[PDB]
């Protein structure tokens, strides 16, 4: 849809991968603020609002927080504390008509600037002249809508740019959109650092004989500590004390070493 009436769509209740979206050669213009490109997957958001439209090459710079312009003031206003960012790419191939007027229009006249994230459907005549226009279209009563005229021969500043703005909202509720956080391979029979569905720990993962219930995820034994996980048992690898048996420096120098409560098949060796 045109910039004067931008189409807004909601993304929620799904996992979003921004890494593929950000590492794309198609998207020429990618400036993001209030968000981290490095941690976008880590960040979670309740709602995503995507506003899509088409503008000129010069007007892309106008669409930015704290930036004012003809398009920004009367068509699309961005809040100062805006969270999210904008994506722009060239689409001169789509507007391949040699020459003529297009249905794309922008509100070049308006009584006053827009409030942030405000849409103006009405296209009534702008009474520019102080004389009462009396609802007559003509001089001093110019039509607010103005066409674009996207010609293929036009310069780089006049080429059509397909601009989509994503705004991320965290309401008074848990987020519904999170990053892929793709899982890595599973390693057992050796004590490793594990993070299963937010349950963090370190230890050996071992094949399990205990049978859980279909809805059950974690597993706790007496004293409320994790002993199994979904099914693998978590057993922390051999830790203990080490003591040094010496006959006394007065009589000798060599010593023996006892690793207490350690099956030393792992680490003149006696069990």
């Amino acid at each position: 849809a045109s910039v004067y009436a931008w189409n807004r769509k909601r993304i929620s209740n799904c996992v979003a991968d921004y890494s593929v979206l950000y590492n794309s050669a198609s998207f020429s213009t990618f400036k993001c603020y209030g968000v981290s490109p490095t941690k976008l997957n880590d960040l979670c958001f309740t709602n995503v609002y995507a506003d899509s439209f088409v503008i000129r090459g010069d007007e892309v710079r106008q669409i930015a927080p704290g930036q004012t312009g003809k398009i920004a003031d009367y068509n699309y206003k961005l809040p100062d504390d805006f969270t999210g960012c904008v994506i722009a790419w060239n689409s001169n191939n789509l507007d391949s008509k040699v020459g003529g007027n297009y249905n794309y229009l922008y509100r070049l006249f308006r009584k006053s600037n827009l409030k942030p994230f405000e849409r103006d459907i009405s296209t009534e005549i702008y009474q520019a002249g102080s004389t009462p226009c009396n609802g007559v279209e003509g001089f001093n009563c110019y039509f607010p809508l103005q066409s674009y005229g996207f010609q293929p021969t036009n310069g780089v500043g006049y080429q059509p740019y397909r601009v989509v703005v994503l705004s991320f909202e965290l309401l008074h509720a848990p987020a519904t959109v999170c990053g892929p956080k793709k899982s890595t391979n599973l390693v057992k029979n050796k004590c490793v650092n594990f993070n299963f569905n937010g349950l963090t720990g370190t230890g050996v993962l071992t094949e399990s004989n205990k049978k859980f219930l279909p809805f059950q995820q974690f597993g706790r034994d007496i004293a409320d500590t994790t002993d199994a996980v979904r099914i693998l048992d978590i057993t922390p690898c051999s830790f203990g004390g080490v003591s040094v048996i010496t006959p006394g420096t007065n009589t000798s120098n060599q010593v023996a070493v006892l690793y207490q409560d350690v099956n030393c098949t792992e680490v003149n060796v006696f069990q």
Epitope: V98, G99, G100, N101, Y102, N103, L105, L108, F109, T123, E137, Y142, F143, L145, Q146, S147, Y148, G149, Q151, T153
Partner: nanobody, 129 residues
Framework: QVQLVETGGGFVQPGGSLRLSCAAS????????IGWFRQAPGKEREGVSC????????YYSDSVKGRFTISRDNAKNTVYLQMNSLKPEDTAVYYC??????????????????????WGKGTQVTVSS
């Protein structure tokens, strides 16, 4: 490379008759509204006339009095404006300017704002005692 030019500014005592020619070159638009905007020294940018190329509908100010006739020369891509009974205050340098048409709701609108795309070197008209 769409070019516009104005010619024919004339000097004479009050009440004369003059012809202004608006010649364009390399126009890439099938439909275009053409306007005349005056500017002498001390005199700002205010519209006098603007015309739609699809049919020839004409918008004009409270100072036309009928002596401003603008013909759409289709063959020579020109606006032929002729004014008789010269007005000593309408003295000014004149720019003839081209804007794209508007296709909204299946109908054509021709809007000519204070800024109208590209302008052209003006022609000064002086008429005084």
């Amino acid at each position: 490379q769409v070019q516009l030019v104005e010619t024919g500014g004339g000097f004479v005592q009050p009440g004369g008759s003059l012809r202004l020619s608006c010649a364009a070159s390399g126009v890439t638009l099938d439909y275009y509204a053409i306007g005349w905007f005056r500017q002498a020294p001390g005199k700002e940018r205010e519209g006098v006339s603007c015309i739609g190329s699809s049919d020839g509908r004409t918008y004009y100010s409270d100072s036309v009095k009928g002596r401003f006739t603008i013909s759409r020369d289709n063959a020579k891509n020109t606006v032929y404006l002729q004014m008789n009974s010269l007005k000593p205050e309408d003295t000014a340098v004149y720019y003839c300017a081209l804007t794209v048409g508007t296709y909204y709701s299946g109908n054509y609108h021709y809007t000519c704002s204070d800024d109208m795309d590209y302008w052209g070197k003006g022609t000064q008209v002086t008429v005084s005692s």
